[PDB]
Design a binder for this molecule. Structure first.
Ligand code: HEM
Ligand code: HEM
Ligand SMILES: Cc1cc2nc3c(=O)[nH]c(=O)nc-3n(C[C@H](O)[C@H](O)[C@H](O)COP(=O)(O)O)c2cc1C
Ligand SMILES: Cc1cc2nc3c(=O)[nH]c(=O)nc-3n(C[C@H](O)[C@H](O)[C@H](O)COP(=O)(O)O)c2cc1C
Ligand SMILES: Cc1cc2nc3c(=O)[nH]c(=O)nc-3n(C[C@H](O)[C@H](O)[C@H](O)COP(=O)(O)O)c2cc1C
Ligand SMILES: Cc1cc2nc3c(=O)[nH]c(=O)nc-3n(C[C@H](O)[C@H](O)[C@H](O)COP(=O)(O)O)c2cc1C
Lengths: 400, 494, 400, 494
């Protein structure tokens, strides 16, 4: 850092932000956030763990699936509504939990998020971070409609009386579920944070320094089963990264699983969820677990075609973290309902072009997976050979 | 745009200046007034360019970009209010279309101001694209050049041809080579054709599509031209401009929500002498071309729908069309094998494996790979000789055409290259584009040691890396950044 | 271009060229040639056909083969000598024919080539272009030693009396073989040439304009068989690009085949010879054709490991075109014997490190082919996503 | 370098200035004269630096880069002519070594002039490499950093670790994690070690390898250090510098052509207390590091051979060595499964799957893939628990080590990172490098949900793209050049 850099940010941000109808993609918000957030806002929000390979891979794995559209289908009308955990949604996507929304929206934080999700014609579920800057209560209450669903995302405390009280205050507030996050027993190392944070004593800590009393690094399957007895809210495990765990989730009867790697902020070299979903849906089908568990997916969703690809492989919904945080930060609640409109229209426009008219018609045979597994690395390309080499050239232009 | 005049009404610059909002929009096109309110949501070109030019003389934006027969045909008689009393407050009269064009017409007009190399210096098709990019208006560049969303299909169309290699034959007598073939019952001097494209007037305002008709039928080598339903020229003018009685014309049909209109357009085109009907089926909803959009707001879902392109067409409609006409029907926009088979079941004459130049669905596959898996499956069901299979998207070299012809396609189309040869040099740029390509095909055929189209077969190809469409692991920035490559020898003087 | 640009070339070339002992690789010559040749010299020599994909692919295909070296082998001594068409060579590489060596060496042309090949301790065969700037006779005669072998590379004329006389003048001169080039029945289009050549009427020609009376586009297998009767020189077909032709060469009894695509100057999208050799050697083994035909290979050879890879797959020798032309052009006959020394030492140094001591020990199990076929093309990478994205960053440095 | 003095002779600056050519070369090292003619072709560092410094005071080039015991040990008594009469014409006295260093010692000496961030600001191992690159001499940078020829192996070593993904376990109690293991009969606090590297004096001239001994045994976490036969410090000094009696030392052996010498070095090292002998076998001939060479001539085949590294070692020599010593023998430089099996047949205790940091044979494979195909084959023959398998090359992150440990390696070595932590910060940079890595391993283990080395198994890995080492078709320059990407939204003020 903040080298009285605000003068520029602020200027940068001065009705400088282009109007909202100039916004085209979910990438526009991101480029906008990248310029106008504070350094600490950008580093926290945008970073992934270590080399950020997983974070990037989450997005690219969607780039390896192609479609097999049907033509000559009457697509005058399309429906994109579905049911996620007993409830019925207008769209098959949601706002995932992201701690610290005030870094970006200092006056309204997550309140603004609730607003955008319910103030327009499309109403979208909002997952609530146990690490939210605002309180559950200011949040559930800020929702402008009574048709909008809210989900509580829980981190279990090492002091479990705290998660007792917690669960109890969330069911009395009307959240429709609990997402239990399991991929952060220890905190991933986001080097972007730390770098800017070296800007120049705790009292002991080493790798240990990444441990936390808020995240019982001791959670187990067994704690999940004790949780089912203390509540009515359907239970969803957030952070599954292999098939065998998904099969564990059904074996002990939770309601869902979210195939997630924390948006690439936890273990680097975890696979894209999109690929775990694909390995996974058929295994479940094969043992009779498919009507038994709803599988969610998050990580690198930036387009409606990405949403349609996770939906054809079997997902019930798919979540988005960063795009919303960015929309929320340059334009508050209005930037958020706009990001929702952008998404909703890509899905519908894409659906007509694939030749289907409802979510239930989304199936794997609309996809080409041939190259999903073509995650590759080439041989270090040859310097000396590419350097002296000169390629073709176009026709110049002319005289004067 | 004509008039129709009625004979009287009698409008005025404030009676008309008054309706300058949707809920009613009136516009002056020439001397006449029109209520475009009920029409705007359907405009093939977007509801905005009209909505935002509300009650004005739009004359200068409309005149140059449209076919002479639009108003007659698509506007109800009741929408032609009246003749405009004299003129309009001036600066209520719109200038010509060039979103973003920053008084930039001078470098560009100079840029082709005979800065354009002689046509004889053109070596390849990329040369037309390079020249067009520097001289078309920012907005004709974006219209012509973009693809849907992220543009992965558009690039993939091209790229898939580079995953194919050849296994040429050596010591074969290649003195004589024949590239002539038959497409839909006619003999053609070549295996490629000029695909349907709208708005040829944006880069060639004096002649649009009439110039494509000329450069395709004026020389020693004639090429079939596919005419769009949304062409900037009337079909009758494009046909009358044709120089041989030996050149072929095909019509690209977009089925209207109002079938009578379509019924009517079919009957007209058979009378004008086109020889085939291509029904485009990959655009029930308008592809989102972002470079373009961005230019407009910087220089829904149902806003992508238009009555002009029925979102409701079905196989059944195809089947009814065939009882209504003797021209062979081709389905254009087919993107998977299952629809090719269906096309064979209903009995049409062919299909175009296309994704529309990559301007519709992004993640749609390269037609060359759909071709590779489709043909073997057609042979298995003995449906191979009962349907002709064309393909288009990203075809820039003679070896590209050959690759398609060895896989079983009957002909290949091109859209973008001819737009750019037509926009930089008109008719002779079209003619030069045809000569560049014909030569490339002859030249590569001698080199592959085959002497006729009939000889092109799958054995001349190496297909082992066709499905090697891959994505790399994001690799290490942090590591490759700290690294230094080797280094060649420097010299001493320098 | 020649915009009286010579003043600079010439300056550039003025004892500016670094001494010969400063030369490390075959790429050094190339970068040197790239700066000091005339525009017409560089365009002719360095170009390939159309997009130049084959030309590049010739080199990269060698980059997809890895080795499985043997350790603990006594490699104090190595021998790299072998026999190519009855004769015995010091090295298992040769100088292939390249028309127009005077574009680069205006005073000595191909004479200088003969010299370099025979004036040092290592003597290498020199293939002679039917389109050589100097005459066979000035060439055979310029060879400084009587141990050096010379090969005649033949283009058959549409007027066959000319190739009668031709063959006869070459056997009387003592060339030890005839290489018949078959991959140029029509001339490939090297756009680099043509571009610079537009620098601003024949009397008819079109694709036809690429035909030539010197290259009977009418040669056939049958003409080859008539050729065998008119001579004693073993016959080698130059320009085979698939396996079925190689099997045709043995079926009619020629002595060799050169797996070649003209250095990427003929048909674009022809495969790397290195890969055709690999498909090919085992087919031959399988029918008993292997002691019957010697297979040569050329195209993108720039290192001794490339030579060892073609030799482990079965090749008898391998040829080099451009590197020599470049050596010949910046330093004449001396640049050529130096390029030979550079190569010879990479082979020997590489052999010790693979654990073998003679050419006959080079075998496919010293190679890993797993990924030879991994010639791939990725999906157009995403602009908007890579653009806003920022990777990690190193530690800066400090104060003042 | 000592002297030995004899007692008399009595040389002079012209008697010695006179032999300034090969065929005889004499040099003044300190106060004494030596005929280096018969020796130069063997110099581990190249025949040139000596040949070209012919009859001079080379004192300033030799003193700082060599172990104190070289002259005693490798030069015959007859080569120590005599004490030099006083001094030498000056400018016959060589300056210190820094090929290319253009009076550039000032930006660099300032550059670390406390321009070097506090050690506490170091986040990863790439940070040491970045800092070293800016502050080492051009020639210490090239020595340390290059690989053989085109450098494909060196990059491939690193890259192959990025083709491996994990399948982590969720809901496992990860409060406690243990990373301690056993390597060659000893208990080690961690699964990695510091590999043998020559010339630690180039980046750390005051202490070289004695600083690596300190940063590996001074803290709470001790790490095995592998000492090179070609180290810049005497083995006895490197061992005496060690701070714990709990830290382990291993000796890297290069077999001489003169076996007595080797016989002698083995016996010395067992007496000093090293605990294992690593015989390096991948360098019978010296790898051609081009960045380095280029610096020298810009700032054969048998010239790559030296008596110091017998090109003649065989399995049989390995087998004889084992009768001569009780230390466990490791073969270092193994690059294919067949040699691992052979190592198991002769009964040695382990091997290092290595290609030498990519400094020897270019096209040699990544040790991580040789590991992946080797272990399953060892299990089949039940040879798995009879040989310990180490691996080195391009290991920069804790997830890299884990990947190796899940595949069955017993420990992983690192060479370059410690060179650079030692050259920028000495002992505490070594200690900090060990703490960075230990933490990364603990941190990733919690996240993979395992709690001990013993739990790391192949099921925690996704290996499906390990052999996806690929090369793309040269793609189209001519086409991708004429193309424009989409474009994000701009802002208005800017
Ligand atoms: C019945 C009346 C009209 C008809 C049938 C019509 C038809 C069309 C068609 C077929 C296109 C090109 C379609 C494509 O790219 O697929 C187009 C584009 C366009 N129209 Fe019209 N049009 C009419 C009236 C108007 C009017 C009154 C205006 C005055 C603003 C107008 C302005 C434009 C412009 C500016 C474009 C090019 C837009 C772009 O691509 O950026 N049109 N129209
Ligand atoms: C018996 C006497 C000597 C012995 C045993 C010896 C040994 C060594 C060794 C083991 C290395 C490092 C090896 C490596 O990187 O693997 C080396 C490098 C070097 N030696 Fe010596 N050396 C001796 C004499 C000399 C003398 C008299 C000079 C005077 C010029 C000299 C100059 C150098 C230099 C400059 C290097 C580093 C070269 C480079 O990598 O650029 N050495 N020597
Ligand atoms: C800035 C930031 C904060 C996050 N905080 C939380 C959190 O408190 N709890 C949680 O379960 N997930 C958290 N996540 C993970 C997300 O819920 C989600 O898995 C992720 O962002 C998916 O990837 P994507 O952002 O690219 O869309 C956070 C992600 C980000 C980017
Ligand atoms: C500017 C433009 C306009 C187009 N308009 C139409 C049209 O009206 N009708 C149609 O069937 N296809 C239309 N197309 C698609 C094509 O006819 C064709 O499928 C595409 O141009 C093939 O790809 P290519 O441009 O890479 O050669 C158009 C394409 C372009 C680029
Ligand atoms: C400038 C040039 C001229 C050539 N001329 C001939 C020729 O006259 N006859 C022939 O058979 N090959 C000719 N070739 C092809 C070569 O003999 C050889 O196949 C080729 O150069 C192999 O590829 P490389 O140059 O990268 O080493 C020529 C190649 C080049 C580069
Ligand atoms: C500068 C340098 C010097 C080396 N010297 C030796 C040595 O004397 N003995 C040996 O066995 N290996 C030697 N090596 C190789 C290694 O011990 C090791 O195999 C390599 O450094 C592992 O790869 P890395 O640097 O990517 O971590 C050396 C490596 C480097 C980079």
């Amino acid at each position: 850092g903040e080298t009285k850099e605000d003068i520029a940010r602020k200027e940068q941000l001065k009705s400088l932000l282009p109007p909202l109808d100039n916004i085209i993609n979910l990438y526009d918000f991101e480029y906008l956030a990248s310029q106008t957030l504070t350094k600490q806002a950008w580093a926290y929000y945008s970073s992934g763990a270590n080399d950020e390979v997983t974070h990037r891979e989450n997005h690219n794995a969607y780039h390896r699936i192609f479609f097999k559209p049907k033509i000559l289908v009457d697509v005058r009308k399309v429906d994109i509504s579905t049911d996620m955990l007993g409830s019925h949604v207008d769209v098959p996507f949601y706002v995932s939990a992201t701690a610290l929304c005030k870094l970006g929206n200092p006056l309204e934080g997550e309140k603004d998020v609730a607003r955008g999700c319910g103030q327009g014609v499309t109403k979208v579920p909002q997952m609530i971070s146990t690490l939210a800057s605002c309180s559950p209560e200011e949040i559930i209450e800020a929702a402008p409609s009574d048709k909008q669903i809210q989900w509580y995302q829980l981190y279990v405390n090492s002091d479990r009386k705290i998660t007792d009280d917690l669960v109890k205050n969330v069911e009395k507030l009307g959240v429709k579920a609990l997402f239990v996050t399991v991929d952060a027993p220890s905190l991933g190392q986001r080097e972007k944070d730390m770098k800017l944070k070296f800007s120049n004593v705790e009292e002991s800590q080493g790798a240990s320094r990444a441990l936390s009393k808020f995240i019982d690094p001791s959670l187990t399957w067994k704690d999940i089963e004790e949780l089912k007895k203390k509540t009515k809210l359907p239970i969803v495990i957030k952070g599954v990264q292999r098939t065998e765990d998904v099969i564990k989730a059904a074996e002990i009867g939770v309601s869902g699983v979210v195939l997630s790697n924390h948006g690439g902020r936890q273990l680097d070299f975890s696979r894209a969820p999109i690929e775990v979903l694909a390995e996974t849906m058929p295994i479940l089908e094969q043992r009779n677990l498919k009507d038994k568990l709803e599988v969610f997916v998050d990580g690198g969703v930036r387009r409606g075609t990405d949403v349609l690809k996770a939906l054809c492989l079997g997902a019930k919904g798919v979540g988005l973290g960063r795009p919303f945080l960015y929309a929320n930060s340059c334009y508050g609640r209005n930037g958020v309902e706009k990001a929702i409109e952008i998404l909703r229209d890509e899905i519908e426009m894409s659906m007509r072009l694939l030749g289907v008219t409802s979510i239930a018609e989304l199936k794997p045979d609309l996809l080409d997976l041939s190259t999903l597994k073509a995650r590759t690395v080439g041989v270090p390309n040859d310097v000396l050979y590419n350097e002296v080499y000169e390629g073709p050239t176009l026709t110049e232009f002319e005289d004067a």
